[PDB]
Symmetry: none
Subunit: 25 residues, 5 copies
C-alpha cells in the first residue's frame, strides 16, 4: 500500500545511488 511512490512533474530525472550522474542541456 504505497510502499514506494515517486511523483514528479516538470522535473529532471532523479538519480539515487552512487556513481550516478545526469547532464541536462
Amino acid at each position: 500500500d504505497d510502499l514506494i511512490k515517486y511523483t514528479i512533474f516538470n522535473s529532471s530525472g532523479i538519480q539515487i545511488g552512487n556513481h550516478n550522474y545526469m547532464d541536462v542541456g
Copy 2:
C-alpha cells in the same frame, strides 16, 4: 493495491540503482 506507483510528466526516466547514468540533450 498501488504497492508501487510511478508518476512522471515532462521528465526523464528515474534511475534507481548504482552505476546508472543518462545523458539528456
Copy 3:
C-alpha cells in the same frame, strides 16, 4: 507503508549519493 516517498513539483531531481552531479541550464 510509505516506506519511500518522493514528491516534487517544478523542481530539479534530487541527487542523493556520492560523486553525483547534475548540470541544469
Copy 4:
C-alpha cells in the same frame, strides 16, 4: 514507515553527498 520522505515544492534540487554540485539558472 516514512523512513525516507522528501517533499519539496517550487525549489531547487537538494544535493546530499560529497563532490555534488548543481547550477540553477
Copy 5:
C-alpha cells in the same frame, strides 16, 4: 521512522557535504 525527512517550500535547497556548491540566479 522519519530517519530522513526534509521539507521546504518556495526556497532554495540546502547542500550538505564537502565541495558542494549551488548557484541560483
